């Protein structure tokens, strides 16, 4: 079969349930902290310590 016949490649299952929703929720946390850092250094800023 290694020369004559052929096959088909789908190649991406990735269906690991808890791992999937870990990916999604971790990404949501990322976008949270990203926009936080952005408007953090963007707008009027007051701190918790001095100069953070």
């Amino acid at each position: 079969x290694x020369x004559x016949x052929x096959x088909x490649x789908x190649x991406x299952x990735x269906x690991x349930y808890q791992v999937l929703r870990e990916k999604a929720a971790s990404q949501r946390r990322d976008v949270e902290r990203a926009l936080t850092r952005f408007m953090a250094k963007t707008g009027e800023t007051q701190s918790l310590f001095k100069d953070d």
């Binding site: 949501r28 976008v31 949270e32 990203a34 926009l35 952005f38 408007m39 250094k41 963007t42």
Partner: peptide, 24 residues
């Protein structure tokens, strides 16, 4: 928050607020 982040980072990408430019 997807399009929120998208909104303000595109708006900072277009507006010339230079510190906000470089901070983006």
């Amino acid at each position: 928050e997807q399009q929120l982040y998208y909104k303000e980072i595109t708006e900072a990408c277009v507006g010339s607020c230079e510190a906000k430019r470089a901070e983006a």
